[PDB]
Design an enzyme around this catalytic site. Structure first.
Site, mmCIF file in Angstrom:
data_model
loop_
_atom_site.group_PDB
_atom_site.id
_atom_site.type_symbol
_atom_site.label_atom_id
_atom_site.label_comp_id
_atom_site.label_asym_id
_atom_site.label_seq_id
_atom_site.Cartn_x
_atom_site.Cartn_y
_atom_site.Cartn_z
ATOM 1 N N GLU A 230 0.831 -1.755 0.147
ATOM 2 C CA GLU A 230 0.037 -0.597 0.201
ATOM 3 C C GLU A 230 0.827 1.151 0.219
ATOM 4 O O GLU A 230 0.400 2.295 -0.414
ATOM 5 C CB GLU A 230 -0.926 0.327 1.213
ATOM 6 C CG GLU A 230 -1.628 -1.017 1.013
ATOM 7 C CD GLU A 230 -3.017 -0.766 2.199
ATOM 8 O OE1 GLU A 230 -2.550 0.401 3.235
ATOM 9 O OE2 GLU A 230 -3.369 -1.506 2.824
ATOM 10 N N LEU B 273 -4.994 5.634 1.929
ATOM 11 C CA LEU B 273 -6.144 3.860 1.810
ATOM 12 C C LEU B 273 -6.008 3.172 2.531
ATOM 13 O O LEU B 273 -5.472 2.744 3.622
ATOM 14 C CB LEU B 273 -5.345 3.627 0.535
ATOM 15 C CG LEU B 273 -4.097 2.483 0.826
ATOM 16 C CD1 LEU B 273 -4.008 1.497 -0.735
ATOM 17 C CD2 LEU B 273 -2.870 3.816 1.021
ATOM 18 N N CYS B 274 -7.150 1.741 3.071
ATOM 19 C CA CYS B 274 -6.763 1.620 3.652
ATOM 20 C C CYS B 274 -7.591 2.297 5.041
ATOM 21 O O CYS B 274 -8.470 1.887 5.148
ATOM 22 C CB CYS B 274 -5.257 0.113 3.266
ATOM 23 S SG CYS B 274 -5.749 -1.172 4.679
ATOM 24 N N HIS B 275 -6.469 1.188 6.451
ATOM 25 C CA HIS B 275 -6.651 2.296 7.184
ATOM 26 C C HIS B 275 -6.046 3.660 7.564
ATOM 27 O O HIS B 275 -6.112 4.256 8.036
ATOM 28 C CB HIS B 275 -5.799 1.276 8.670
ATOM 29 C CG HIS B 275 -6.793 -0.336 8.863
ATOM 30 N ND1 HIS B 275 -6.869 -1.352 8.221
ATOM 31 C CD2 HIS B 275 -7.974 -0.221 9.292
ATOM 32 C CE1 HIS B 275 -7.425 -2.593 8.696
ATOM 33 N NE2 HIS B 275 -8.141 -1.674 9.276
ATOM 34 N N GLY C 144 -8.052 4.524 -1.937
ATOM 35 C CA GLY C 144 -8.102 3.214 -2.013
ATOM 36 C C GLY C 144 -8.387 2.048 -0.654
ATOM 37 O O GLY C 144 -8.437 3.104 0.318
#
Length: 281
Positions: free
Chosen positions: A75, A183-185, A258
């Protein structure tokens, strides 16, 4: 191999990497990096992107164990890879100034391109800037940052979400109409603005709380998270667009997100395109 027991981390007592089973399902020896080709890259030599990385590896679970986490390297590096090819440089910072901590167990060991990019930036990940110094001298009205990148991995859940330093950075980016990329966390970091309604009405993708509730069942983490960043993001005005994950990304004005560890390549393409189109004044 199919073992679902969390894997002890020899560096830290009562700390665990993901189980061997969860690793065979959620990590791979190569990334899906593709389409990083920008025939007319930015060559102005000014605009740069600030990376706010995680300085801690050990996350406290609801049962007293530490998840041995950090920033997710795919990531982190896929978006950088595209932005690099597009002609942008990076400065890397953490809150403490201590080294950026990677989830090395998710690093794709066979991926020549991704390992090449890490080689290029390794001195900066290992000896990053301290965010307070950045805030003091490198922001303001005439900053050379075109945007800020906050990678995911569960390491993003420590310090960033209530750092007054992160708050200053996000306030600056919105005030000066700069890109915010995550993105993501990673979007947990957005919580740093506290009760400033600055993000009201913004749409994002992020890693679904419900999926965090379930991955420990196969030993991905040695326990469950002690709070839910998705619900907290909704509470400060964000509309979370995704229920599941597929590697998709969204752009709402200059906020680019993301959804998960599947989203790095798409986020890189999205960010490169936006920043290339921008570099025009």
């Amino acid at each position: 191999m199919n073992d679902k027991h969390p894997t002890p981390d020899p560096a830290e007592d009562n700390a665990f990497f993901p189980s061997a089973y969860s690793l065979s399902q959620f990590t791979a020896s190569k990334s899906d990096l593709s389409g990083a080709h920008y025939p007319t890259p930015y060559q102005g030599g000014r605009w740069k992107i600030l990376v706010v990385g995680a300085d801690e590896r050990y996350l406290m679970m609801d049962n007293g164990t530490f998840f041995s986490t950090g920033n997710h390297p795919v990531e982190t590096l896929l978006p950088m890879y595209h932005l690099d090819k597009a002609g942008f440089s990076f400065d890397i910072a953490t809150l403490s100034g201590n080294p950026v901590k990677f989830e090395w167990w998710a690093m794709p060991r066979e991926d020549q391109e991704v390992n090449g990019l890490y080689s290029k930036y390794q001195s900066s990940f290992r000896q990053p800037l301290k965010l307070s110094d950045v805030i003091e001298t490198a922001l303001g009205e005439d900053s050379d940052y075109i945007g800020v990148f906050i990678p995911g991995g569960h390491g993003a859940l420590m310090g960033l979400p209530d750092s007054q330093e992160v708050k200053a950075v996000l306030q600056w980016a919105m005030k000066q109409n700069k890109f915010i990329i995550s993105l993501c966390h990673g979007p947990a970091a957005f919580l740093a603005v506290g009760d400033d309604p600055l993000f009201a009405g913004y749409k994002i993708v992020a890693f679904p709380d419900e999926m965090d509730a379930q991955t420990p069942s196969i030993g991905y983490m040695p326990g469950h998270l002690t709070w839910k960043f998705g619900e907290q993001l909704q509470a400060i005005g964000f509309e979370l667009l995704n229920t599941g994950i597929s590697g998709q990304v969204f752009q709402d004005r200059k906020m680019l997100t993301g959804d998960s560890p599947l989203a790095g390549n798409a986020l890189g393409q999205l960010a490169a395109k936006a920043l290339l189109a921008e570099v025009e004044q």
